[PDB]
């Protein structure tokens, strides 16, 4: 584990992280798709060998020794409100799950189910207190990756508001 663990975030594409791993917003057909999805696909194509699994859960592929944790988030156009907030809290306790089981000192984490999938809705909020309600049992360090100014003021308001 991170001797003292902490949350972070920074703006900037995921593919550049300096964290032990990666999770990737992925979809249930292990596709290269878009947004996060495609930046993972470019960096580490590998990874997507078998990577398909349902929603609501996280599977893992190796890119040489670099763990990719592929995580599907639902899709908010198909899912109603609620099934999707199940199936959106399920996905992160997954990728706590395997964050463990790999004994990762640190993960690069993205917000699922924002962008293509949010159904068109801001759920800035949702997603990063699920990620929270998974993450905060372990021990890794947790870099939080976005692309927005305001959303990375928002996400630092938030991990700082804890302290
Ligand atoms: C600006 C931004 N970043 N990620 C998102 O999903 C959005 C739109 C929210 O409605
Ligand atoms: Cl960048
Ligand atoms: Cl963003």
Redesign the pocket.
């Given at each position: 584990g991170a001797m003292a663990p902490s949350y972070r975030v920074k703006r900037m594409d995921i593919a550049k992280n300096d964290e032990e791993c990666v999770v990737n917003a992925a979809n249930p057909r292990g596709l290269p798709g878009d947004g996060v999805c495609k930046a993972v696909y470019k960096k580490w194509p590998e990874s997507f060998k078998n990577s398909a699994t349902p929603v609501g859960t996280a599977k893992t592929v190796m890119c040489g020794t670099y763990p990719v944790i592929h995580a599907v988030g639902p899709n908010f156009s198909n899912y109603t409100e609620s099934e999707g907030d199940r199936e959106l809290a399920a996905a992160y306790r997954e990728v706590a799950k395997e964050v463990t089981r790999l004994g990762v000192n640190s993960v690069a984490i993205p917000?699922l189910s924002?962008?293509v999938y949010?159904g068109?809705?801001?759920?800035?909020t949702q997603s990063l207190n699920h990620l929270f309600t998974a993450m905060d049992s372990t021990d890794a360090d947790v870099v939080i990756y976005?692309?927005?100014k305001?959303?990375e003021k928002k996400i630092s308001e938030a991990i700082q508001m804890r302290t």
């Open positions: 917000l924002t962008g949010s068109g809705k801001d759920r800035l976005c692309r927005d305001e959303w």
